[PDB]
Tab-separated table of C-alpha atoms in Angstrom:
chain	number	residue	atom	x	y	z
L	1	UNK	CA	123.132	85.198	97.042
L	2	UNK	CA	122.578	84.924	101.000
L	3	UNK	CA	120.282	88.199	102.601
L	4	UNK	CA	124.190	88.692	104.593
L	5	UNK	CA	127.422	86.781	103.357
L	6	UNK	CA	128.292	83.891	105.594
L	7	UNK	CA	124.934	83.177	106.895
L	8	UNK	CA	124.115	79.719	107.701
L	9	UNK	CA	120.592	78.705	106.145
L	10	UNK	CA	119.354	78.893	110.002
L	11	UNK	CA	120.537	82.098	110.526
L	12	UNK	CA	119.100	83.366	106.814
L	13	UNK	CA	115.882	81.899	107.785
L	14	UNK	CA	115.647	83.672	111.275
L	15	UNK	CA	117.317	86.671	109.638
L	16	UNK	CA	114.350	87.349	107.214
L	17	UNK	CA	111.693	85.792	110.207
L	18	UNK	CA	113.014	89.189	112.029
L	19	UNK	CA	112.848	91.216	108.790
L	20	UNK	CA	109.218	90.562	108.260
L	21	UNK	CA	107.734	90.069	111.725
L	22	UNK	CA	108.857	93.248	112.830
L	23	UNK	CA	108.132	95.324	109.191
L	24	UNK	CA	104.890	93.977	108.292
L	25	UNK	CA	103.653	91.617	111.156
L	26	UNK	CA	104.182	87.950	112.493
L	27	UNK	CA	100.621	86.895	112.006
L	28	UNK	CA	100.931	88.426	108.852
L	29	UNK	CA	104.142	86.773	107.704
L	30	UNK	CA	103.154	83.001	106.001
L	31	UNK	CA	106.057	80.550	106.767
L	32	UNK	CA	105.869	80.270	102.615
L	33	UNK	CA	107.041	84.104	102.376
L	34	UNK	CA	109.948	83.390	104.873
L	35	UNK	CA	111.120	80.861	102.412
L	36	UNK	CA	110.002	82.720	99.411
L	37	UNK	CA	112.783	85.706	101.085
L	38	UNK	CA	115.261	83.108	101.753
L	39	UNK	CA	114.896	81.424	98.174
L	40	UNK	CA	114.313	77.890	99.370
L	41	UNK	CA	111.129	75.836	99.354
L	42	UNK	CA	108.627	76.065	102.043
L	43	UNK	CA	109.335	72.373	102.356
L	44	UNK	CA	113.159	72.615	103.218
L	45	UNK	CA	112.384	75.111	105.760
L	46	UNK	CA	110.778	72.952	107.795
L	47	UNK	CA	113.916	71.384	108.738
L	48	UNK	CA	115.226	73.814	110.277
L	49	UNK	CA	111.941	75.217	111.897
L	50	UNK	CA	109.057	72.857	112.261
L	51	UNK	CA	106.494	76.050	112.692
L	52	UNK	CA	106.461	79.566	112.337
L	53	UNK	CA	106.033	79.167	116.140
L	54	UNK	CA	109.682	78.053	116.876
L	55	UNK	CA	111.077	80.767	114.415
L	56	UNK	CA	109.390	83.498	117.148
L	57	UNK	CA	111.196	81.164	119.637
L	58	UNK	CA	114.530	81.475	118.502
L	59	UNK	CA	114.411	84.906	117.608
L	60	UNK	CA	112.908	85.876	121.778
L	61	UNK	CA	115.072	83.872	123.593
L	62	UNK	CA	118.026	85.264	121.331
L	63	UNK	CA	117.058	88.833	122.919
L	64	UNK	CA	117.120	87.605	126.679
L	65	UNK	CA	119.789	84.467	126.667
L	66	UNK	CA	123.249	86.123	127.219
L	67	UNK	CA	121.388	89.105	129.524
L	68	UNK	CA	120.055	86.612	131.590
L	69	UNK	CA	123.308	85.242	131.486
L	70	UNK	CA	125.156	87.619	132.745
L	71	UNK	CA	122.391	88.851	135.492
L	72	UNK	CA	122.668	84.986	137.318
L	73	UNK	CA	126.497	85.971	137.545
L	74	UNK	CA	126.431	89.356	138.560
L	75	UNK	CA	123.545	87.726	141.516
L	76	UNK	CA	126.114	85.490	142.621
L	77	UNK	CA	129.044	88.234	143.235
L	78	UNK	CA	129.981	90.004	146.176
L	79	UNK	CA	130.392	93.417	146.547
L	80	UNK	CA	128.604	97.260	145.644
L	81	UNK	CA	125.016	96.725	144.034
L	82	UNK	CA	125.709	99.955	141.370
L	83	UNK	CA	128.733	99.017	139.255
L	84	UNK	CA	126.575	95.450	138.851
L	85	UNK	CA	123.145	97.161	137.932
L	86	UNK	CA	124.911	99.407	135.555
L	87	UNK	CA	127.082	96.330	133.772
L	88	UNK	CA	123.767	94.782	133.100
L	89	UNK	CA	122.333	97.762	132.014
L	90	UNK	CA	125.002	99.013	129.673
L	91	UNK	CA	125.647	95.345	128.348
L	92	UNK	CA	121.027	94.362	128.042
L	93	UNK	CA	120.418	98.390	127.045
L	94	UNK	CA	123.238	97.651	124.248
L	95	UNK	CA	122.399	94.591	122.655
L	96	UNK	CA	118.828	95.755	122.328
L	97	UNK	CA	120.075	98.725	120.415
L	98	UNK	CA	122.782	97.115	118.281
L	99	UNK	CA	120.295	94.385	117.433
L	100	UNK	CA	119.909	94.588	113.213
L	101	UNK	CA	116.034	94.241	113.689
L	102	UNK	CA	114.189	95.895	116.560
L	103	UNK	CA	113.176	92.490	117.867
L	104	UNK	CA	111.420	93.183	121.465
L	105	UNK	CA	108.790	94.814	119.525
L	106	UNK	CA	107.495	91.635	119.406
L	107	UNK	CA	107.188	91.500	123.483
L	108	UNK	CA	103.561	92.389	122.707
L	109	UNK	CA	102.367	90.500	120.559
L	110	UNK	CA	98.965	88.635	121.618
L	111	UNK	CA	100.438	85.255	120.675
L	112	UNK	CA	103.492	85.434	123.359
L	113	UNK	CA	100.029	85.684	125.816
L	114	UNK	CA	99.704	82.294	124.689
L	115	UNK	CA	100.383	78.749	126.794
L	116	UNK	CA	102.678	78.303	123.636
L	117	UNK	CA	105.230	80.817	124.896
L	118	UNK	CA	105.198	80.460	128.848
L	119	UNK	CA	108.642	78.921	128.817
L	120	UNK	CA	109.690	82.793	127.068
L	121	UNK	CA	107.570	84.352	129.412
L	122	UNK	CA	109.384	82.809	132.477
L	123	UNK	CA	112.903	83.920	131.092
L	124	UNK	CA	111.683	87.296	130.426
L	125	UNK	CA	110.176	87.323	133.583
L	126	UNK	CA	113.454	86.013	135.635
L	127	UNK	CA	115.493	88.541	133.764
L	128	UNK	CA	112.657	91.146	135.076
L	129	UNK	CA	112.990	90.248	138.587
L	130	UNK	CA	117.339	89.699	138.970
L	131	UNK	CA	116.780	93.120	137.415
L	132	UNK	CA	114.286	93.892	140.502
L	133	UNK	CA	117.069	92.481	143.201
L	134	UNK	CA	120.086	94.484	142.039
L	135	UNK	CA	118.416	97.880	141.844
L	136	UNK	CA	116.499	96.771	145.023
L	137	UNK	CA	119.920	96.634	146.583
L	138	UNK	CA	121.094	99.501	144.457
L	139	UNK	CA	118.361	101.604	146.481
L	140	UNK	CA	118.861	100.047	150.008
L	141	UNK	CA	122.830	101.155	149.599
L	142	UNK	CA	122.079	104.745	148.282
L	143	UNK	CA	118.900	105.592	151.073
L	144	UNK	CA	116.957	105.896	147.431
L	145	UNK	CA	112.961	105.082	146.789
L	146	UNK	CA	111.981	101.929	147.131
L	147	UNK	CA	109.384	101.516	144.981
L	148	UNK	CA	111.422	102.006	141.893
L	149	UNK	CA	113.126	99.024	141.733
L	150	UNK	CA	111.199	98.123	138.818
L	151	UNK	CA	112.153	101.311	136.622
L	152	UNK	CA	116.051	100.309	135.556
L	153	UNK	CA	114.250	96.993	133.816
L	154	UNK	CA	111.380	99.689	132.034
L	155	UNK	CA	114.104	102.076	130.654
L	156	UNK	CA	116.334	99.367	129.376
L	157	UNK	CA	113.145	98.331	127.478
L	158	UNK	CA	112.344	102.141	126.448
L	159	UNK	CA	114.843	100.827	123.959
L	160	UNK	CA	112.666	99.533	121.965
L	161	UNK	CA	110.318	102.346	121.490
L	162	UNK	CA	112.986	104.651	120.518
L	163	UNK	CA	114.311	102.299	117.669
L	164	UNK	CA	110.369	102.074	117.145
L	165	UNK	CA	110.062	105.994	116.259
L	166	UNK	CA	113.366	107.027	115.358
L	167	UNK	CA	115.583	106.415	112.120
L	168	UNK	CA	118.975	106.336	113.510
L	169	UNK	CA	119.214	105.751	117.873
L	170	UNK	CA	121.605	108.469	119.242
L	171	UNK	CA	125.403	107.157	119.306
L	172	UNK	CA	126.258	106.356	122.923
L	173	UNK	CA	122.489	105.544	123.680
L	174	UNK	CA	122.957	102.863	126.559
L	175	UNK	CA	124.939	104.792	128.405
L	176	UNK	CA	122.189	106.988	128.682
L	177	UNK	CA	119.943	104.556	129.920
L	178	UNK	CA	122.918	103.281	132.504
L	179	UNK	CA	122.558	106.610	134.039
L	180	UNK	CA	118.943	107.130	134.031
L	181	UNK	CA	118.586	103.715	135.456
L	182	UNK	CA	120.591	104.148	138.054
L	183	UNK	CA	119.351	108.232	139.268
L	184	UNK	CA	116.090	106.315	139.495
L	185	UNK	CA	117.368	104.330	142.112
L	186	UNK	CA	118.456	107.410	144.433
L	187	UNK	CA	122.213	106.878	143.106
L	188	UNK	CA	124.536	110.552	142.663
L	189	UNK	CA	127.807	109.265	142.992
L	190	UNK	CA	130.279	109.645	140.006
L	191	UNK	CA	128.926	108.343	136.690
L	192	UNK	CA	132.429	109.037	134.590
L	193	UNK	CA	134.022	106.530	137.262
L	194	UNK	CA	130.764	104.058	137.060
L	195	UNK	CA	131.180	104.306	133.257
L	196	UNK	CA	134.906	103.354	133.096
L	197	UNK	CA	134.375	100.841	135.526
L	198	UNK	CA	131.388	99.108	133.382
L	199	UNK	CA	133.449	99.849	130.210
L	200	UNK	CA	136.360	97.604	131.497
L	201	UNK	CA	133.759	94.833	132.823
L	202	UNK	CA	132.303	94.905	130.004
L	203	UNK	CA	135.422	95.014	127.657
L	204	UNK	CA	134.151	97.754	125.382
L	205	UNK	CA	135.003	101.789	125.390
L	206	UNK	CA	133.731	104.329	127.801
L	207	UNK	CA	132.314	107.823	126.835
E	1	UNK	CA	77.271	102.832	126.253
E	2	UNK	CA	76.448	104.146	122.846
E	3	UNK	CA	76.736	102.058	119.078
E	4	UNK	CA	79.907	103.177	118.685
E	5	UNK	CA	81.218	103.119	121.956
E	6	UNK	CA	80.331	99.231	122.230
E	7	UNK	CA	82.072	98.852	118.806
E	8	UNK	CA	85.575	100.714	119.997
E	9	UNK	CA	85.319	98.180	123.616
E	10	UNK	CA	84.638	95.467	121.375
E	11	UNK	CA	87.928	95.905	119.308
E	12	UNK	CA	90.086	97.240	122.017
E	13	UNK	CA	89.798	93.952	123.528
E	14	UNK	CA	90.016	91.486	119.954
E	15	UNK	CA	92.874	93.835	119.004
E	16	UNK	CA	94.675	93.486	122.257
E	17	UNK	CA	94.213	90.119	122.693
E	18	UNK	CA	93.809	88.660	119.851
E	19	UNK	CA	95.520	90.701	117.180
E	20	UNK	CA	95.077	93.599	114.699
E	21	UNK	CA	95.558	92.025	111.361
E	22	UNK	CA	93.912	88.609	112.577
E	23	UNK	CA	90.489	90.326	113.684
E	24	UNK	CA	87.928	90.816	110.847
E	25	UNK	CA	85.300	93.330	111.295
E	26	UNK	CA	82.970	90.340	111.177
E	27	UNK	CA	84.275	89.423	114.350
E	28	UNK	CA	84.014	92.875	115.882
E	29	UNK	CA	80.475	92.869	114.764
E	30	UNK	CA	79.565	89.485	116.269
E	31	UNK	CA	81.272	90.199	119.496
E	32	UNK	CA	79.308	93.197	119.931
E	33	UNK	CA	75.952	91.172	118.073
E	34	UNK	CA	75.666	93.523	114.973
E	35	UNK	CA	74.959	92.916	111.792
E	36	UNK	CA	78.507	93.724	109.557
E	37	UNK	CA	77.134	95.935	107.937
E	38	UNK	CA	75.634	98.487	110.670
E	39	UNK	CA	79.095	99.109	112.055
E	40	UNK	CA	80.197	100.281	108.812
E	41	UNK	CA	77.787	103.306	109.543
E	42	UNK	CA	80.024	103.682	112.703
E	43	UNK	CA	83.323	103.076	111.581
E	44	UNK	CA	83.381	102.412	107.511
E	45	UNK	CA	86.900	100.542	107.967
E	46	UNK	CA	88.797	98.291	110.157
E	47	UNK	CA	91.643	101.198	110.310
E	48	UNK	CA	89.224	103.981	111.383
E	49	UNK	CA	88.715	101.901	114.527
E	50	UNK	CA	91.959	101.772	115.498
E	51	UNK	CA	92.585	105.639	114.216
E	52	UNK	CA	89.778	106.462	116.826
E	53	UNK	CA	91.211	103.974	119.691
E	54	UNK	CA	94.822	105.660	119.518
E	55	UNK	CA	93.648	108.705	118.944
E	56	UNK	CA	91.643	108.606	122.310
E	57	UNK	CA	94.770	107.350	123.712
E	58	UNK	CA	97.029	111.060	123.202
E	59	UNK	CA	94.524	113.546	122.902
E	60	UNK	CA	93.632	114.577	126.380
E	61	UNK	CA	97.799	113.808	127.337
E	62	UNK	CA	98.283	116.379	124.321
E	63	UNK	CA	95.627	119.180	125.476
E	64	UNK	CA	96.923	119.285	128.925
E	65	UNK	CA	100.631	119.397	127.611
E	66	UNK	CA	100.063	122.352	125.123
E	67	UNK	CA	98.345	123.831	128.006
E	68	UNK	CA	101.305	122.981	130.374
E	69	UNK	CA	104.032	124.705	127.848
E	70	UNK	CA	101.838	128.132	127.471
E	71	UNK	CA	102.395	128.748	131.236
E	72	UNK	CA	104.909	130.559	133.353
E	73	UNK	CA	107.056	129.006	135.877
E	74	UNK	CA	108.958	125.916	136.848
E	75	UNK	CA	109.421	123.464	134.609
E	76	UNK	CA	109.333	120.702	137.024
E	77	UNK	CA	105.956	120.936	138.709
E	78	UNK	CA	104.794	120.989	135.252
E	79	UNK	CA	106.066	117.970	133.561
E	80	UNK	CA	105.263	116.381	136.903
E	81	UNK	CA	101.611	116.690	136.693
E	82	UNK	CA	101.817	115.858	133.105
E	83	UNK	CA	103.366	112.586	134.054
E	84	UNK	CA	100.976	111.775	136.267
E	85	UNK	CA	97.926	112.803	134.264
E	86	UNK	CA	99.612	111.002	131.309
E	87	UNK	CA	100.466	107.499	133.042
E	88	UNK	CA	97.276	107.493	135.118
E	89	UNK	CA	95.247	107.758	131.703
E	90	UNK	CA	97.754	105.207	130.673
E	91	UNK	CA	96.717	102.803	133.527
E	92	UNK	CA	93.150	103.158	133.695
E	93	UNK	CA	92.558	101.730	130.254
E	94	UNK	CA	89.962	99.208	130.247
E	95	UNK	CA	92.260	97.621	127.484
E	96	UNK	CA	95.933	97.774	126.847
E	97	UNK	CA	95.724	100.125	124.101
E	98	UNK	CA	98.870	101.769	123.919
E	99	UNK	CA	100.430	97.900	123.259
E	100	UNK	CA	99.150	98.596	119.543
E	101	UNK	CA	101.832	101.933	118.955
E	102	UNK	CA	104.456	99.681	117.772
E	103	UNK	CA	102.083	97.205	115.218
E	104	UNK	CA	103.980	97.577	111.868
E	105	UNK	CA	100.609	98.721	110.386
E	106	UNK	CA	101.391	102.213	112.256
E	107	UNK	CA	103.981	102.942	109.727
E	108	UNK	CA	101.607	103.515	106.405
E	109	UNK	CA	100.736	106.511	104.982
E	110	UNK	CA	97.207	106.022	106.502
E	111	UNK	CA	98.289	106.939	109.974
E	112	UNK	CA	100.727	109.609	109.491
E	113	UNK	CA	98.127	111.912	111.383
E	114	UNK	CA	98.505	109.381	114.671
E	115	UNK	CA	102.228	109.584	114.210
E	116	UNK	CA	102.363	113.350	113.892
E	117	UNK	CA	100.582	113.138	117.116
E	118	UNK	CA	102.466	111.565	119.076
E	119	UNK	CA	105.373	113.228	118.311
E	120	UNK	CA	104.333	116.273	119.313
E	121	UNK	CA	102.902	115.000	122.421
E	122	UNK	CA	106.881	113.040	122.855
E	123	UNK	CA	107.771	116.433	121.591
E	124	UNK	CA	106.090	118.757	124.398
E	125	UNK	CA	108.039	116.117	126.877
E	126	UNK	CA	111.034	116.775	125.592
E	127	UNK	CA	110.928	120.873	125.922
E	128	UNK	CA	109.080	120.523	129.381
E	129	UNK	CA	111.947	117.996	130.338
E	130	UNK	CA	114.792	120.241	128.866
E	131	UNK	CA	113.990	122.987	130.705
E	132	UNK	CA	113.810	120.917	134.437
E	133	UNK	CA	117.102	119.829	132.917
E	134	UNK	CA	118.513	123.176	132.790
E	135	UNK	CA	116.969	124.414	136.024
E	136	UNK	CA	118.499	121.315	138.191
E	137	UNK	CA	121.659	121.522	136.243
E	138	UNK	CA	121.107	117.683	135.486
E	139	UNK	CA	122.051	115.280	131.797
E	140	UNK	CA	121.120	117.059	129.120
E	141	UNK	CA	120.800	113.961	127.360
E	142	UNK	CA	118.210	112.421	129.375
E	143	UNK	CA	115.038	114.710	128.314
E	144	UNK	CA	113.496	111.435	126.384
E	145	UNK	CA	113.697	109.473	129.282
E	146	UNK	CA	110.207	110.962	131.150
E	147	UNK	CA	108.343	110.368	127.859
E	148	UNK	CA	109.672	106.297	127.993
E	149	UNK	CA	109.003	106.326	131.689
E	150	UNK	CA	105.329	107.455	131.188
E	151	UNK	CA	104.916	104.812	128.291
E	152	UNK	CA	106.596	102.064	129.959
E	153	UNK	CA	103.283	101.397	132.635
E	154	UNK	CA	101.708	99.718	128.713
E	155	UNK	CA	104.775	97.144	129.117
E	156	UNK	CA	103.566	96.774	132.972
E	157	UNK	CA	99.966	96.706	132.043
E	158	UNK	CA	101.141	93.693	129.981
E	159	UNK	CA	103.326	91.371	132.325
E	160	UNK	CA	101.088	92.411	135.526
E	161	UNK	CA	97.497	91.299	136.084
E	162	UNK	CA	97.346	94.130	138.896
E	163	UNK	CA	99.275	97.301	138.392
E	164	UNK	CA	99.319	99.439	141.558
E	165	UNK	CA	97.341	102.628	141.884
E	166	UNK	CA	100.254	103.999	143.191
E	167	UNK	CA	101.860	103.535	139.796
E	168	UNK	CA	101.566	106.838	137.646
E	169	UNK	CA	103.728	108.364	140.957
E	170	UNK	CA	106.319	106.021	141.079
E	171	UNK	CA	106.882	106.742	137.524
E	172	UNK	CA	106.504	110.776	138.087
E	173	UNK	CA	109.603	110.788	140.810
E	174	UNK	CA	111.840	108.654	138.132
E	175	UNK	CA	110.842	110.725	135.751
E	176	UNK	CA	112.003	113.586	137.524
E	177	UNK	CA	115.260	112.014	139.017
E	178	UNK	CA	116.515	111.201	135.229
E	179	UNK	CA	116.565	114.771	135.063
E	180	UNK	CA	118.675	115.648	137.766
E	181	UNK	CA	115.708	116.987	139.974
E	182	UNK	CA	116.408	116.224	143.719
E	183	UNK	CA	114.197	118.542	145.324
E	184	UNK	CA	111.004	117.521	147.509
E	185	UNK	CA	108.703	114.909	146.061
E	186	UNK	CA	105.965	115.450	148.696
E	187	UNK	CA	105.936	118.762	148.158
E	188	UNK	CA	105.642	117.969	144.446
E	189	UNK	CA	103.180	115.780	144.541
E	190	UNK	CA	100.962	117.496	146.613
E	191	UNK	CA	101.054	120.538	144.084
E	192	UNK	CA	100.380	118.013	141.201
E	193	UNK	CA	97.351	116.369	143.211
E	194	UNK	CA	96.308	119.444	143.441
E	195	UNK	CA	96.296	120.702	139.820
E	196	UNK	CA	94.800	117.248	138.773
E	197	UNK	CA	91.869	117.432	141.521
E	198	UNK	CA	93.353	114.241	142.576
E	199	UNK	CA	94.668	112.475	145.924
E	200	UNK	CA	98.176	111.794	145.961
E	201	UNK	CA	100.098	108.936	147.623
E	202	UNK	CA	103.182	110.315	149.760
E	203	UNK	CA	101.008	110.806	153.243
E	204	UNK	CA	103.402	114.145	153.933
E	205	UNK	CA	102.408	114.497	151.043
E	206	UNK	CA	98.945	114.576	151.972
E	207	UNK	CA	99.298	116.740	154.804
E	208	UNK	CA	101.507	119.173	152.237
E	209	UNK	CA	98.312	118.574	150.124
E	210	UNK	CA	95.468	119.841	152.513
E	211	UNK	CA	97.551	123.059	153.394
């Protein structure tokens, strides 16, 4: 009886590694309750994830992979900063949110300030800064403040502390970070436009 | 330093660092070069540390925010210097302390009283914000957006070795453009340097402050 039907035994394991980091704690959480969750032995498990180490592995890089992704593409085009800013934002901002377990609340955890997890660290960080070049460029177009081009990367994080405190995350949530993100930046151009542009980039519905 | 402010250093830094769950109060004890049992007389449990430590984190923020909502007069000024007291307090942590509001242990019974906390302070944020939202005519679904901006410098605190002194003011103008606010941020941060007994950044600014 798998924790969601058509799991493969990877994905149950790293399925109930998420469960119980975030609920009751990753130093807390023995590799033997993982498999006690998943109803296989502590042995087997091993085959799939040598540590409790590499589950934490999987389950980061799984929050910054595709973002990252799309942020080296969006680098490499031509044209206005905004609409590019506010596809990653929409796109990062929504997978954070749609995410079944609230994942980046593991960002702080001391053992990511470990040599362990530099290689994380550096992917997080390289999403952090293509964030930092767009809105940078964002700002330069719209005469806004330069020293917020920071700020879109911090409220696409905010995320995190919103699933943290609240039960449900309001519907259309990313779109409210899109916006925020980019009035940071000095942008007040037309955010119904911006939206249904992003929405079509994206391949997903507007507001 | 007193006893018990040695204690609260000592496991601001082993619970940052090192972890909540993974730090015994024997360690506490030895870092500070106790014997167990005296700190017991200072804080009887591991979780009354960390009550105290995020309590000292939102009760100053929370006084000046009551304060803020009993006055008269525009809204954005007000969140402003709330912002700024807020994110500076924020900053000037010895220790990251705010990186412990999301440790799972939070959600227990035991610290419903933190919570409740908290939520007021997110709470005053929200009705301060509202109301800059309605005077600027900006997104009325943005007024949780200051409270995340003014939490976010514990996420900065946490990739950055350095984080600016100039911070807490970058994070007061977004905090005000989410809003909708365009008016003039050396202006406003004069009047919030001002309220604070503080210097601000701008350099107009500055000059708007000495007036």
């Amino acid at each position: 009886q798998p924790r969601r039907p058509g799991q493969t035994a990877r994905e149950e394991i790293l399925d109930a590694a998420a469960e119980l980091f975030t609920t009751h704690g990753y130093g807390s959480t023995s590799t033997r309750r993982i498999a006690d969750e998943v109803g296989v032995r502590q042995a087997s498990l091993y085959h799939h994830f040598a540590t409790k180490d590499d589950i934490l592995d999987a389950l980061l890089a799984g929050t910054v992979d595709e973002p990252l992704e799309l942020a080296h593409g969006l680098l490499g085009e031509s044209g206005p900063a905004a609409p590019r800013l506010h596809a990653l934002v929409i796109y990062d901002a929504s997978q954070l949110c749609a995410g079944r377990w609230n994942l980046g609340a593991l960002y702080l955890l001391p053992e990511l300030r470990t040599d362990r997890f530099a290689p994380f660290r550096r992917r997080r960080a390289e999403l952090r800064s293509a964030y930092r070049s767009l809105a940078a460029a964002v700002i330069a177009e719209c005469g806004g403040p330069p020293e917020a081009d920071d700020l879109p990367f911090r409220l696409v994080e905010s995320v995190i502390n919103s699933r943290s405190d609240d039960a449900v995350v309001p519907p259309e949530q990313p779109w409210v970070i899109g916006e925020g993100a980019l009035r940071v930046l000095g942008f007040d151009g037309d955010f119904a436009e911006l939206a249904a542009a992003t929405a079509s980039r994206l391949g997903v519905r507007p507001p």
